[PDB]
């Protein structure tokens, strides 16, 4: 039982409370335990508690004693226990409680009166009970009530007598998700006194008994609502009738198998701002299904359409200017659709568009063509994806028409050409470009001239082409400064490709072949393709298969702070290389072939670091290698793990094994 | 003979050996097919069998101490065997009573392999060996208990990739050997560098 401030016993075993612990402990927790009887008169020492978490337990009643000795306690937890019987004088004493959780106790009846003696309690839980009836007393109490939960109970009818207690009461949630409520009474939630969220999951009502709920919201004070998994296969223009007169806000209708959106079925509501259609079985989209929702600030339709069938190839189709009544919609998220393709108008309309996301919404997008994106033309559109799209060929002029994108993300897909550059124009405000996971992409020296105000760019296993011209094609990326150049096998280098990149810093280049370029042997001198990098932070070189490296590369990097090395075959550093780090923090070795460690080269490398990877090398244990190595290794403050674990001395073999 | 080189042979492992009613078989090539399991009674009743080639393979957990059911001896009964490859087989332990029986071994090849240690007193008995190709291995360390009889009488000897440690301990009876012998060694001054420790880095 670990304790400074939060006393905790969680999955301890115990049978009884312990008896010594600070008396000014305020939060004491035994959850996953066997209490079978929790008497009073263990909580002498305990009366400076706030919360008490004494859950998931075997209690099967309570007495009133237990909360006397506790005048500050707040919450109060009795999930998954026995307490199916309530008393008046169960919680009479205390009613500083703010926190009341009662789930799983197998509650069968409120009795007469078990809440009236707290006034100060918020939020109330009675979930996976045996509960039939809202009714939870005869008078009114409970003002300063906000949140009550009745999920998975046992309740078939939700009447007006059984909640006339909340006439002076402020509800924020009313969860009574899995029970099968099949009536409506007249007046019921006007008994309530403010009604601000209904949550009605998983609760079979229908199209009828939808209509006659919103029927019976007509008139209050309704923000959210939530009918998901409802079993709400149609709509009509009258199923939410009864809304006019509220001005609900959130609305949420997933996993309800609706299979066909009726006409004019949401031009009832004109106060909906956050609107959830997800995971869906919609197999047509009228241009008036739509009609209604000008002020809809959140629009999610990830799944919300028909998969395609070989049965009969029933592709969701869209009607055009469907969505034209969005003019104030701001977020759009319809990931892992099956429609078949862009329209010229089907994006028409959008005046206020900020953030539209296509992930895997199409079956088959292979070429992205200059008139796709027509209907975004007036859309000021900032953020902008279209991963597993399946890609295949993008002409020019394909983006000419997003004037005010600034995030791009291209990524896994199977986009294979050559990139002209032209494919860019009208991106002027454009800020990254996500480009990873492609077939292959074939540089030239145009291929971003077009985008100077281009940040980070993404090209990992994308299998680089003509990287190597003469002419560097970062050369007008003035302002880039994430550059990932990874798992393409990338062979040549120019010297001068980040020549003018004063402001990169995120250069990645593992799991590449450039061990060839480091090589004193190599024909034309080693290039130093590090040069003028003055604001480099972060360097990856991993698996590239070095042997060497030049004494000269590492001479500008005044800024380097992490730099990555693993799994090469790096056998012997230069002495005096590392010098210019002044500012390292993280130097990750492992899985290369070196064996010696020293001053001349480490020495500066080791003056202030925070981090080190130098797993799986075979050191050799010698005065003359790893004296100094080891005696910084007996003297530090940087965090090398597993340090007695991997890094074993491989040689000679009078210390095979030994760390 | 029986030649199955890059064939990507399939269910190799089967209870019952295929090559059981081969008692004629003399030549056996299972190289580069990325065989992983091998039974132990695969090549029981083989007593005619000569040249087995085993290189490009995937053999390296049958061999480890640490692999259940103890490791493979899938070369027992195996009088007559001649020519033995075992190249690029990843191993990176060689169990101790593996070439028990090899009476009439001569050619043995254990090239780009992740050998770092031997065994003491695995080799007394190859009485006839007469090539030992150990290139491209990680071995550091050469001694009698373990290369004394091997080197009893050779004609050739593969070892140029390999990180020599240079002490009296591991490599002066080795240099020793280098001095006076009749196996040939060819590029003996080329590439068997000393890599360890760096006082004698690259010091043939």
Same mark, same amino acid.
Request: net charge neutral.
């Given at each position: 039982t670990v304790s400074h401030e939060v006393a905790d016993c969680s999955?301890?075993?115990?049978?009884q409370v312990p008896d010594?612990?600070?008396?000014?402990?305020?939060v004491l927790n035994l959850t996953?335990?066997?209490?079978?009887r929790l008497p009073a008169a263990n909580f002498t020492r305990y009366?400076?508690?706030?919360?008490?978490?004494?859950? /998931?337990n075997t209690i099967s009643k309570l007495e009133?004693?237990?909360?006397?000795?506790?005048?500050?306690?707040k919450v109060l937890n009795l999930q998954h226990?026995?307490?199916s019987q309530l008393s008046?004088?169960? /919680?009479?004493?205390?009613?500083?409680?703010?926190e009341l959780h009662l789930m799983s106790?197998?509650?069968?009846k409120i009795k007469n009166?078990? /809440?009236?003696?707290?006034?100060?309690?918020?939020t109330l839980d009675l979930s996976?009970?045996?509960?039939?009836?809202?009714?939870?007393?005869?008078q009114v109490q409970l003002?300063?009530?906000?949140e009550l939960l009745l999920s998975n109970?046992?309740?078939?009818a939700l009447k007006s007598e059984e909640l006339?207690? @909340?006439?002076?009461s402020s509800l924020?949630?009313?969860?009574?998700?899995?029970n099968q409520i099949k009536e409506f009474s007249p007046g019921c939630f006007h008994?309530?006194?403010?009604?601000f969220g209904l949550f009605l999951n998983n609760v079979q009502l229908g199209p009828s008994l939808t209509e006659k709920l919103c029927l019976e919201l007509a008139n209050t004070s309704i923000r959210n609502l939530s009918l998901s998994?409802?079993?709400?296969?149609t709509t009509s223009?009258?199923?939410?009738?009864?809304?006019?007169?509220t001005n609900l806000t959130m609305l949420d209708l997933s996993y309800?198998?609706?299979?066909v959106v009726g006409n004019?079925? @949401?031009?009832?509501?004109?106060?909906?701002?956050y609107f959830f259609l997800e995971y869906n079985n919609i197999q047509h989209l009228f241009?008036?299904?739509? $009609?209604?929702? @000008?002020?809809?600030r959140y629009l999610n339709l990830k799944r919300s359409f028909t998969k395609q069938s070989?049965?009969?190839?029933?592709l969701p189709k869209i009607d055009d200017?469907?969505?034209?009544?969005?003019?104030?919609?701001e977020h759009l998220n319809m990931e892992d659709n099956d429609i078949p393709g862009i329209k010229?108008?089907?994006?028409?309309?959008?005046?206020?568009?900020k953030y539209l996301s296509l992930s895997?919404?199409?079956?088959?997008?292979?070429t992205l063509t200059n008139?796709?994106?027509?209907?975004?033309?007036?859309s000021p559109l900032h953020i902008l994806n279209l991963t597993k799209?399946?890609?295949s060929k993008i002409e020019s002029?394909?983006?000419?028409?997003?004037?005010?994108?600034?995030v791009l993300d291209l990524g896994l897909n199977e986009i294979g050409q050559e990139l002209?550059?032209?494919?860019?124009?009208?991106?002027?405000?454009?800020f990254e470009i996500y480009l990873s996971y492609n077939k292959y992409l074939q540089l030239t020296r145009?291929? /971003?001239?077009?985008?100077?105000?281009?940040?980070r760019l993404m090209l990992r296993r994308?299998?680089?082409?003509?990287?190597?011209?003469?002419?560097?094609?970062?050369?007008?990326?003035?302002?880039?400064?994430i550059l990932d150049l990874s798992n393409?096998?990338?062979?040549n280098i120019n010297?001068?490709?980040?020549?003018?990149?004063?402001?990169?810093?995120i250069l990645d280049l593992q799991h590449?072949?450039?061990?060839?370029?480091?090589? $004193?042997?190599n024909p034309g001198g080693?290039?130093?393709?590090?040069?003028?990098?003055?604001?480099?932070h972060i360097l990856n070189l991993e698996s590239?298969?070095?042997?060497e490296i030049p004494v000269?590369?590492?001479?500008?990097?005044?800024?380097?702070?992490i730099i990555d090395l693993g799994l090469n075959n790096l056998n012997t550093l230069p002495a005096?290389? @590392?010098?210019?780090?002044?500012?390292?923090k993280s130097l990750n070795l492992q899985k290369n072939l070196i064996t010696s460690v020293e001053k001349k080269v480490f020495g500066p490398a080791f003056r202030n670091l925070t981090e080190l990877d130098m797993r799986f090398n075979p050191f050799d244990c010698t005065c003359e290698s790893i004296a100094w190595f080891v005696n910084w290794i007996n003297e530090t403050h940087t965090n090398i793990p597993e340090l007695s674990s $991997?890094?074993?001395?491989?040689?000679?073999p009078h210390y095979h094994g030994f760390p």
């Open positions: 999955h301890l075993k115990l049978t010594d612990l600070p008396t000014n402990i305020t996953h335990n066997q209490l079978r009366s400076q508690l706030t919360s008490l978490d004494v859950g /998931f009133p004693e237990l909360c006397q000795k506790l005048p500050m306690l226990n026995e307490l008046d004088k169960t /919680f009479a004493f205390c009613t500083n409680l703010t106790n197998s509650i069968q009166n078990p /809440f009236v003696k707290q006034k100060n309690l918020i996976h009970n045996g509960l039939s009836s809202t009714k939870l007393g005869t003002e300063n009530l906000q109970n046992k309740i078939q006339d207690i @909340f006439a002076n924020k949630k009313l969860e009574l998700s899995s008994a309530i006194g403010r009604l998994n409802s079993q709400l296969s223009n009258t199923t939410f009738l009864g809304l006019k007169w309800n198998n609706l299979n004019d079925s @949401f031009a009832w509501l004109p106060q909906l701002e241009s008036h299904s739509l $009609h209604g929702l @000008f002020n809809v070989i049965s009969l190839a029933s200017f469907s969505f034209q009544w969005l003019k104030c919609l010229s108008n089907m994006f028409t309309g959008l005046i206020n568009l895997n919404s199409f079956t088959s997008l292979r008139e796709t994106f027509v209907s975004l033309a007036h799209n399946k890609i002029d394909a983006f000419s028409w997003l004037g005010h994108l600034e002209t550059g032209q494919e860019w124009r009208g991106l002027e405000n454009i145009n291929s /971003f001239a077009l985008v100077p105000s281009l940040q994308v299998a680089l082409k003509n990287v190597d011209s003469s002419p560097s094609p970062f050369q007008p990326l003035r302002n880039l400064t393409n096998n990338i062979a010297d001068d490709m980040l020549e003018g990149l004063e402001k990169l810093e590449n072949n450039l061990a060839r370029l480091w090589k $004193h042997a080693p290039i130093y393709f590090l040069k003028g990098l003055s604001h480099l590239n298969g070095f042997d000269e590369v590492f001479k500008d990097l005044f800024e380097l702070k005096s290389v @590392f010098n210019n780090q002044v500012s390292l $991997h890094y074993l001395c491989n040689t000679p």
